[PDB]
Design an enzyme around this catalytic site. Structure first.
Site, PDB file in Angstrom:
ATOM      1  N   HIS A  41     -70.704  76.747  37.016  1.00 59.96           N
ATOM      2  CA  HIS A  41     -69.567  76.922  37.913  1.00 59.96           C
ATOM      3  C   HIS A  41     -68.564  75.781  37.813  1.00 59.96           C
ATOM      4  CE1 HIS A  41     -72.092  74.486  40.835  1.00 59.96           C
ATOM      5  NE2 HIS A  41     -70.902  73.962  41.066  1.00 59.96           N
ATOM      6  N   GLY A 143     -69.207  67.733  44.657  1.00 60.23           N
ATOM      7  CA  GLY A 143     -69.238  66.910  43.470  1.00 60.23           C
ATOM      8  C   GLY A 143     -70.622  66.495  43.013  1.00 60.23           C
ATOM      9  N   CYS A 145     -73.160  68.521  42.255  1.00 56.15           N
ATOM     10  CA  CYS A 145     -73.805  69.463  41.352  1.00 56.15           C
ATOM     11  C   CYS A 145     -73.943  68.855  39.963  1.00 56.15           C
ATOM     12  CB  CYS A 145     -73.015  70.764  41.307  1.00 56.15           C
ATOM     13  SG  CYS A 145     -73.262  71.711  42.816  1.00 56.15           S
TER      14      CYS A 145
END
Ligand SMILES: *[C@H](O)[C@H](C[C@@H]1CCNC1=O)NC(=O)[C@H](CC(C)C)NC(=O)OCc1ccccc1
Ligand SMILES: *[C@H](O)[C@H](C[C@@H]1CCNC1=O)NC(=O)[C@H](CC(C)C)NC(=O)OCc1ccccc1
Lengths: 303, 303
Positions: A41, A143, A145
């Site tokens: 993503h 942020g 991930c």
């Protein structure tokens, strides 16, 4: 003596964290050999995330759209691929800090260390258990991930978790390093349910053993129980059923304290039916279940 | 979101840990520049430790009696000195992994990360608070002395703690990196008392703010209090008196939640007088005091 929630030293992983930016989205990637792994993503705009078609989105991205940065040093991307829910970015430089490593899919009830990172820079490290419902109780902001979870055995890093998402209940979900989610989750920003969580019975017992090894004895009693009798109580309290495999794994602790496993089950039974009466075990007023038997042995013998 | 007890990434410190052996005693040292720091009781036999005369003991040791080993690689010792309760071993090689670093003496109520080590090899990392009575609640086995506590600010490591001893109560005591003990302790294996411990009031308040920032609100109420009125209650419960400096430090949290500090004190007052009724705050059934205000801001903003 003493007993604490302890994370593995993070140095071997710190050297593998990089920043990955695609358009306006920035998260972390894991740089091993000449490959950078990151959540897929990263290719989404904040609007795409509510219902992404990752195939159609990825088709508009080329290698030069993936900005990969190791410290202040940029990496050159020479290929990209999507494996399940992660991207594999091929770079022209092998990470000179690559440790010996394995990709493993961890089982529910096992623990691992999380190195929480932002912009490719480590922020802190903490221990997590993979809940029976395949969630973890983490600390993750936007942020984060691409932050990974890992175990270390001497010099080998077993990577087992990459972070992707926070559920509406405040818990956290992710994938293994091949991009397969732990649990029934998808990487779309829509309401998703983890289902009933249950307490990791074998871990509670290990932590009660850890408590005895460290001088907290008030909960030992003159009672015993059977596997079947205890599990009728575990049921009522959403505890995992105990098995003979569990009993065997508690062997080493059952041998260093001299307390039979079914005797410790009898103590747990009374703690479940009667509460702790405002008493405390290893400085906690709840029954703790995020320590595996392996974890207690390691800490109570200095591995 | 989420809130966890988080240690700093340990990589910068991992590269500084070495093994120091003198006769039959082995512990850890900290290798910075061309100097290795370690507890001075490395020169004791297990019998000397009950009443050592460190001056007379050190006088029988020469440079070649200090075996210093970085990994499997030996270091050559070219000088030695005793500063308070630590030894400084001069070696002929500067640690090529030396980070930017400072030696600081931490204040009671502040937190730091401990890298627990054995035989010069890291075992795990966890966060500790320096109690008001200058103890810490650690996890230390034999051989763990020389393990250090530290903070990190961007790229600078502030070393603040070196471990030496466990009291009879199970808590842990040590020195700063100049060898001065935190608290009224000496490095002799004899019964020593830390005195009454008190709860770090300002840290409890920060953790209640952290609880609100993460959705636990049940303890907020319609009451307020005064600094003087609250401190009459803090007294009864062995809490540290709250000050205006404390109030200022809670400012940022008081501004991100919109909750006045004296209003949060009113909630704490009710929790102290009435208990938690079997409810939980950030997954704990006790009031937690090992998070500083700085700690909560850092974690709730991704530093
Ligand atoms: C990746 O950095 C991020 C991690 C979330 C943000 C806050 N805490 C976390 O653990 N993940 C997402 O933003 C994710 C993207 C999907 C395409 C999987 N969606 C997500 O977690 O949405 C729920 C949420 C967003 C923002 C705050 C709280 C929950
Ligand atoms: C140094 O490695 C060691 C750390 C102790 C051992 C168990 N847990 C700890 O934190 N320190 C000592 O052995 C120390 C030496 C003196 C000369 C300062 N004495 C000590 O801690 O004695 C108390 C004790 C010994 C063994 C087990 C439990 C408590």
């Amino acid at each position: 003596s003493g007993f604490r929630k302890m994370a593995f030293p993070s140095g071997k992983v710190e050297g593998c964290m990089v920043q990955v930016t695609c358009g306006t989205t920035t998260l972390n990637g894991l740089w091993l050999d000449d490959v950078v792994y990151c959540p897929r993503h990263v290719i989404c705009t904040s609007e795409d995330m509510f219902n992404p078609n990752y195939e159609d989105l990825l088709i508009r991205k080329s290698n030069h759209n993936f900005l990969v940065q190791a410290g202040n040093v940029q990496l050159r991307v020479i290929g990209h691929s999507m494996q399940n829910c992660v991207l594999k970015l091929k770079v022209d430089t092998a990470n000179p800090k690559t440790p010996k490593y394995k990709f493993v899919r961890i089982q529910p009830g096992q623990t691992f260390s999380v190195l929480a990172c932002y912009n490719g820079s480590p922020s802190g490290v903490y221990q997590c258990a993979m809940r029976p419902n395949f969630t973890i109780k983490g600390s993750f902001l936007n942020g984060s991930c691409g932050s990974v979870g890992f175990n270390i055995d001497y010099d080998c890093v077993s990577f087992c978790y990459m972070h992707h998402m926070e559920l509406p209940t405040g818990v956290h979900v992710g994938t293994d390093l091949e991009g397969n989610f732990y649990g029934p989750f998808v990487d779309r920003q829509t309401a998703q349910a983890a289902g009933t969580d249950t307490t990791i019975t074998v871990n509670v017992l290990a932590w009660l053993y850890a408590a005895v090894i460290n001088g907290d004895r008030w909960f030992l009693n003159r009672f015993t129980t059977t596997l079947n009798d205890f599990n009728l109580v575990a049921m009522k309290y959403n505890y995992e059923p105990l098995t003979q495999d569990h009993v065997d794994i508690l062997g080493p602790l059952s041998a260093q304290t001299g307390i039979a496993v079914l005797d410790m089950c009898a103590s747990l039974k009374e703690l479940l039916q009667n509460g702790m009466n405002g008493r405390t075990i290893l400085g906690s007023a709840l029954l703790e279940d995020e320590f595996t038997p392996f974890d207690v042995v390691r800490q109570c013998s200095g591995v």
